[PDB]
Design a protein around this ligand. Sequence first.
Ligand SMILES: *[C@@H]1O[C@H](CO)[C@@H](O)[C@H](O)[C@H]1NC(C)=O
Lengths: 24, 49
Amino acid sequence: AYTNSFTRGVYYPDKVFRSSVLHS
Amino acid sequence: FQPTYGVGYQPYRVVVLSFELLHAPATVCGPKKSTNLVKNKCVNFNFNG
Ligand SMILES: *[C@@H]1O[C@H](CO)[C@@H](O)[C@H](O)[C@H]1NC(C)=O
């Protein structure tokens, strides 16, 4: 059986705080 | 290991201290004292190193 992930499974990549920014 | 062995073949105890020096809260620190905080003024500072 299968289903679609869509956009699931993003996580905070490091223990830093950031705001209003398009981080890569 | 026998105490008669040549220096390279003698046992050595090894300890490796591995640091997670992360951008994350501290739980191990060096012997630093701490001051009161100061606000709205130009200060030299040190938080967690
Ligand atoms: C992917 O999921 C769909 C869900 O309808 C399925 O039909 C398809 O066989 C699956 N393909 C692979 C390669 O898993």
